[PDB]
Amino acid sequence: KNIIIKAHGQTNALIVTAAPDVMNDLERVIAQLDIRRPQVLVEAIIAEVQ
């Protein structure tokens, strides 16, 4: 019928009670959607004279 995705939030895990045959189209996409992310350090400087 449809794909019903439910997310827990209290263990930070999600379910998939949807098609029992093409779930592979979900494992691939979540695997491409869970990835460590790099972070950047920003510093700015200003100066003047009067």
Binding site: R36, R37, Q39, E43
Partner: protein
């Protein structure tokens, strides 16, 4: 904190409310010292007459 050595209170609301406010998001390893936020600044002024 609040200083109020001398400040602008016009018999209205007497307050300075010195503050520094940080917010961000970071990925960090378990046992690790981590630099989050930083500021360093000098300020000079001169007055001459002859």
């Amino acid at each position: 904190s609040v200083a109020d050595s001398a400040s602008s209170t016009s018999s209205d609301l007497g307050a300075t409310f010195n503050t520094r406010t940080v917010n961000n998001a970071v990925l960090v390893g378990s046992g690790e010292t981590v630099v989050v936020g930083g500021l360093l600044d000098k300020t000079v002024t001169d007055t001459a007459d002859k």
